[PDB]
């Protein structure tokens, strides 16, 4: 059997039930007023390694480089027929997958551990992002069968690949660190929309039980994105399905004139002139002068 | 602090409600008029008049796997029944879907690789009908307001497709009520308990 | 002074590295599906039951140069065999493209433009393979994870293209390296030698 | 030198032409690159004195910059969809003449985008997409247009041409 919704249902219940429990928690820690060794660790066990410190790079840099991991998993997912057993035990495959999924659970439970407050950080949207893809990888190994679920969400952990270029020392200039969190941005959100088209065209319209659905691959729906915000729409790639048609008449309304009509691009483009230079380089040897006052 | 972090919780209350209500609108408008069509076919009793061939051949088309696309013939059975409803002469169809890829025949075999074995489906189904002719009679499905030339063995879809697809707007929309609520008491109670200190 | 066009020296080592990275995953990602489906076909071996005409005649297209579009028949041959690795009876194709074509027929001839020479050559095969029956086994390629009921003489792709397309990028990625070293060396290396007249 | 533009143009052309000589069989390869040549055009104005003042000078520049890029890239979707895609066995080409190819740029750039002719090829739909991204957005969204669109008129005059046998008079101070 085609058990779809056990998979859904393993993020759904986790986020909202998570949800309910501080809630109530919070709520009750409060009430109990009116019906009249834990808390030490948490600042440094993880939370020395986790960021910003000299050597905490690995909780920020192999968590992204993990998440492009299991990206390049679900774009190779998405290249077959959703119906094959030989890339399914002792290739690569699911138990690869694996591995990058257990680590974003340690991370989120060291992240939740080191959180001032429970319910802000439940939902942020890392959290969420984290909801959406770590439970049904469990549930897929437990039934034994792989998914191609909302998996292409882990394309938001591009986002803040602006930090990682300026730990490394790669970025140093703040106008450059705003040019790529745009771009990464831009970048992300494409990727993360192409997924939702390839998920609502490859299943088709349920009032029209999913016989119009429409093979699309992943790079078909990519290129239909691009093709589209970039207003050429030829329409030799379109949308048939009629989630398909909404999906997309909510994209180009959020992609035209929300997500784009951006104003930093134009104040950003002139970025790398507006400053003017860092420090002398002293070579050795070279004799060295310095001239200043009124300089015309 | 909590306050700067519990109107998060507002807006995605608030987002919640709404999507779930625009959700039941949205498979409101879609659903309607396959549901109104489906329901608006009667239930009715049958006993088959005769079972025959027209002698007509029609093609169906065979995936050997992987976008293979061959294709291969079938003799076009046709079966005609009483009925119970309109006491008039109609022509049975398996299913919607079977009447809509060929509303000349009474059945479509699951197409194969070879002639003779859409052939013996064929005369493997037509066998079976030609014992129920008159015998113990069967309900039908049947619709005078639009086809009455037509009966079916099924509905076009089934029940719960439907049903599942409109309870978890709702429940959508009862999550974020609940969820505002919520914080309601936690923004509220909070600091009437809280200010007691 | 030489510092003022290195560095146009490391831009283009620095291009050179990430488009073979890139061109490697780009190559990768559509080679991967079409390449995994060829090997997937297992080799086994194999003799041929029967050979035999089903009577029924197809069409195929003849290009008599420059755009020219005629049409000829063909009569459909089709010949089966024993399997060593599903001993099961499966139905003999030339290669993956001929299957694709037309799954009806185990050959294809090369489409000519009068109806008595697709005739002649498809009797030129049929006598041939009614001498290999049974007589001197084969290997055969077979695919029994997705397409079970036929066997091919071919693979789909030949290795050379797919070895040839993901070597060169490898090697602009080494050369861009290199490059990137060689500036390296003739801007540290330099200064160092240079320094001491 | 070496990795100066107009040596790799000169690179990617001339040697295999000799190849082709040598082995006796014309080639339908990278040649098209020879219109990256027109780009210094509006040095050829100047030489000949037929261009005089400096912002039509990059307003030709510009245009020839836009020239030669559109012909180049029509050249690299040609070649690119006349070849099909290596892991198709080269099965899925579509023949697109070079002018076809030049229309479906123009039809493209525009943001038109009829779809009576468009690249078939996954390399086609690669090259499109990096097309489309750096043709907007990179290659226009220029400035220098707006600012020099007035520049026949931001430069009042060169010299008086003093025609023999009229005679001529100079006025200048306060002039309103
Ligand atoms: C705010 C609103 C969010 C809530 C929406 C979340 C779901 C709302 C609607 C949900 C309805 C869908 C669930 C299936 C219906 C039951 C049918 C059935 O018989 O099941 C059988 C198997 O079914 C299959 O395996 C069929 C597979 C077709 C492709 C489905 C993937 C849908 C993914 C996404 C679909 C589009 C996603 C749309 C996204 C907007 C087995 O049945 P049984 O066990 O014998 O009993
Ligand atoms: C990088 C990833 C590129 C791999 C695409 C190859 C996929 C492929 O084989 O063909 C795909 C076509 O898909 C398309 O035609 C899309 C063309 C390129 C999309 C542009 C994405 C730019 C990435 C932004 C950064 C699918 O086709 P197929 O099913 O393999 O072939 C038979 C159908
Ligand atoms: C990374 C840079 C170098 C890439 C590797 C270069 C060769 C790699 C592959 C090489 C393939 C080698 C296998 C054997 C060839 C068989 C020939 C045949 O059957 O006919 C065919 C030969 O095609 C042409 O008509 C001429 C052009 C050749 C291919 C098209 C250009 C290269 C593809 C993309 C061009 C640039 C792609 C840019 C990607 C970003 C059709 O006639
Ligand atoms: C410079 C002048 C070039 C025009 C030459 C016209 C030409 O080549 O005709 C040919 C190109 O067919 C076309 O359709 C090419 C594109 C049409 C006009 C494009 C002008 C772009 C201007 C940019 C400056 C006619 O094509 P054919 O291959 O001879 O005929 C076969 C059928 N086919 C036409 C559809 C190809």
Known sequence: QRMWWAFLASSMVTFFGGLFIILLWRTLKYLWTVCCWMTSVKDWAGVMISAQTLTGRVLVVLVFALSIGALVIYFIDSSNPIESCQNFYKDFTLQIDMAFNVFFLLYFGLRFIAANDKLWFWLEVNSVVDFFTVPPVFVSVYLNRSWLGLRFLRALRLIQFSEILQFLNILKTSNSIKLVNLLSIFISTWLTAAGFIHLVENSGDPWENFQNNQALTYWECVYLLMVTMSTVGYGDVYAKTTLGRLFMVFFILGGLAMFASYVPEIIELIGNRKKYGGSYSAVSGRKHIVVCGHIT | ?197
């Not at chain 2, 051949?57 to 992987?66: I, K, L, N, R, S």
């Open chain 2, 1 to 197: 602090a909590l306050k700067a972090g519990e109107d998060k919780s507002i807006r995605l209350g608030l987002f919640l409600i709404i999507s779930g209500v625009v959700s039941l609108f949205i498979f409101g408008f879609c659903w309607l008029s396959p549901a109104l069509q489906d329901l608006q076919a009667t239930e009715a009793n049958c006993t088959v008049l005769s079972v025959q061939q027209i002698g007509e051949v029609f093609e169906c088309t065979f995936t050997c796997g992987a976008d293979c696309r061959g294709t291969s013939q079938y003799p076009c059975v046709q079966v005609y029944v009483n009925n119970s409803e309109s006491n008039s002469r109609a022509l049975l169809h398996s299913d919607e879907h079977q009447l809509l890829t060929n509303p000349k025949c009474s059945y479509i075999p699951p197409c194969k690789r070879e002639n003779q074995k859409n052939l013996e489906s064929v005369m493997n189904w037509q066998q079976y009908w030609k014992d129920e002719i008159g015998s113990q009679p069967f309900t039908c499905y049947f619709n005078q307001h639009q086809r009455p030339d037509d009966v079916l063995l099924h509905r076009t879809h089934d029940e719960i497709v439907l049903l599942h697809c409109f309870l978890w707007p709702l429940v959508t929309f009862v999550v974020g009520v609940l969820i505002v609520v919520l914080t309601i008491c936690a923004k509220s109670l909070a600091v009437k308990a809280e200010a007691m200190k």
